[PDB]
Design a protein around this ligand. Sequence first.
Ligand SMILES: NC(=O)c1ccc[n+]([C@@H]2O[C@H](COP(=O)([O-])OP(=O)(O)OC[C@H]3O[C@@H](n4cnc5c(N)ncnc54)[C@H](OP(=O)(O)O)[C@@H]3O)[C@@H](O)[C@H]2O)c1
Ligand SMILES: Nc1nc(N)c(OCCCOc2ccccc2CCC(=O)O)c(-c2ccc(C(F)(F)F)cc2)n1
Length: 160
Amino acid sequence: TSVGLIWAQSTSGVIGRDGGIPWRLPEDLAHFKRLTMGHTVVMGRRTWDSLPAAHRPLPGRRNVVVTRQTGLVAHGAQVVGSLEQALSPAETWVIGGAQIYALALPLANRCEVTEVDVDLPPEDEDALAPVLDQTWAGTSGEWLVSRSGLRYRMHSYRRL
Ligand SMILES: NC(=O)c1ccc[n+]([C@@H]2O[C@H](COP(=O)([O-])OP(=O)(O)OC[C@H]3O[C@@H](n4cnc5c(N)ncnc54)[C@H](OP(=O)(O)O)[C@@H]3O)[C@@H](O)[C@H]2O)c1
Ligand SMILES: Nc1nc(N)c(OCCCOc2ccccc2CCC(=O)O)c(-c2ccc(C(F)(F)F)cc2)n1
């Protein structure tokens, strides 16, 4: 019933580039697994096809893919034709990408953001993070240092 968006972004707001994610941050993958394990995860079809083969479907989670197609070549998803169909019938996580974040933003009650301090000026075809309006209240964790050297931190928003 509760609908959460979860994403990682560069400070500049990039979430996706060239059909993938333009940084590596192991600590964020662990965070993403902890928050989503045992829950339904909803994603757009491009994100489904973007998963490396070892990670598709996401293990231990019910994988729901939003698409206008009849069905998919890549196995392991339950396909739906709309976000509403994905959401009904306690925690449903929308895990990307930009198109599916835009669809889910009006419905969500939580956002869990990882900010990665990697210098990625936006390029012409990048997917960008959604912008949160005045209906959201947020708290931010401290800056952390990855074993890879990148700084990162988590922001958590709840609908007012
Ligand atoms: N940094 C992060 O946290 C994060 C997370 C996830 C993904 N990403 C990145 O985000 C990028 C992909 O995002 P994206 O915005 O291009 O794609 P997306 O949101 O993953 O998927 C778009 C697809 O969803 C389907 N769709 C969209 N709106 C729909 C609607 N109203 N009804 C039914 N189906 C609908 C369509 O599938 P069909 O074409 O099959 O009809 C469409 O092509 C990649 O670079 C990925 O690596 C980043
Ligand atoms: N905070 C956060 N919220 C997300 N919605 C998210 O995306 C989830 C869809 C992609 O999931 C992948 C993609 C590739 C490899 C593995 C997975 C998930 C595997 C699993 O969970 O068992 C991410 C995030 C960021 C970077 C990477 C990276 F590894 F590509 F760098 C992965 C995920 N991070």
